């Protein structure tokens, strides 16, 4: 599971921002991970915590 689910967010977030923001290119991906910066590193650091 886990591995599919940590990747599902960044794949979806681009499909999410194109439907919302309207902007289609690479710059749409760019800003998605702006809200998933610690939601990748920190979550992994507390995944390992258990």
């Amino acid at each position: 599971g886990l591995l599919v689910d940590d990747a599902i967010v960044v794949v979806e977030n681009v499909e999410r921002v194109m439907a919302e923001e309207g902007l289609p290119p690479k710059e749409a991906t760019r800003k998605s991970m702006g809200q998933i910066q610690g939601a990748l590193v920190g979550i992994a650091m507390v995944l390992s915590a258990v």
């Binding site: 886990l2 689910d5 939601a39 507390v46 995944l47």
Partner: peptide
């Protein structure tokens, strides 16, 4: 029990991220 606790976090800490951002 241990997988479904950080995996559950990866949804809570994910929306809490979306919230405090």
């Amino acid at each position: 029990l241990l997988t479904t606790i950080g995996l559950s976090a990866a949804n809570a800490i994910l929306i809490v991220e979306f919230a405090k951002d």
